[PDB]
């Protein structure tokens, strides 16, 4: 449940992510509203068209959050506190949506990081995102 090997691979993947991060985060949002329209439902004060500078600005924020999380992997509950309150209490996102976004992030990490995206690596990111997610929902269960 986030072994080192796991914390090592995450690291690399995100390692090889760099600054494209913001754009990568934006790309996942865009793939998520695309394949998971309903999700659009939480972003009504948003320009959700193809080049949304808003979407651009968020993709950044989200990615930024991941970098952090990646950075405090063994302390996420704490590194991610704030958002847990934002998401559970404030936004009240149906926990489900979390699975959709990780699937989207994954699909974008793979599309860009072909060489790094390997079963084990894929397996380690999945578990990673999986925790980030669990933490962002702790306010529920």
């Amino acid at each position: 449940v986030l072994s080192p090997a796991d914390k090592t691979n995450v690291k690399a993947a995100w390692g090889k992510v760099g600054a494209h991060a913001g754009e990568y985060g934006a790309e996942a949002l865009e793939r998520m509203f695309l394949s998971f329209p309903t999700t659009k439902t939480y972003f009504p004060h948003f320009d959700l068209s193809h080049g949304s500078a808003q979407v651009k600005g968020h993709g950044k924020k989200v990615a930024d959050a991941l970098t952090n999380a990646v950075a405090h992997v063994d302390d996420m509950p704490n590194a991610l506190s704030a958002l847990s309150d934002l998401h559970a209490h404030k936004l009240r996102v149906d926990p489900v949506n979390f699975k959709l976004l990780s699937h989207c992030l994954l699909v974008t990490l793979a599309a860009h990081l072909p060489a790094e995206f390997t079963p084990a690596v894929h397996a380690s990111l999945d578990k990673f995102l999986a925790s980030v997610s669990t933490v962002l929902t702790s306010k529920y269960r």
Binding site: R31, S35, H103, A110, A111, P119
Partner: protein, 146 residues
Amino acid sequence: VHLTPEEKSAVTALWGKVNVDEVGGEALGRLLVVYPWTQRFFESFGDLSTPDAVMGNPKVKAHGKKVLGAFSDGLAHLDNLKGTFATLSELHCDKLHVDPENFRLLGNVLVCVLAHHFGKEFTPPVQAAYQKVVAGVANALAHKYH
């Protein structure tokens, strides 16, 4: 499933680029590596000990062919999916008792995989068309449970 004609095209377009002999196993293997409890169903396969073990097992790559093959029929039948998968649905639900959740999980690793091969070419709109498909396939497979 419904699908737009620049949708229905595009899927099919990309699909034609697929190395069927291969993609089947990258998906199946990855499923088994990423969601280990699915290995239960495939105990007879040989050694699934490791990722490489799994990714390399010939029973895995061969069956990866059969499955991708199911996907091709579905594509040719983006309407009568139900009709198309009726028999498999039986094998799967009645006899194997696989949880329907596992089909969503499979179609989602094959999406990752397609993304994997095609890079920039699997744009978001492309993904979405595929998402549509994969999902229809899933309901289709899980029919016998409803």
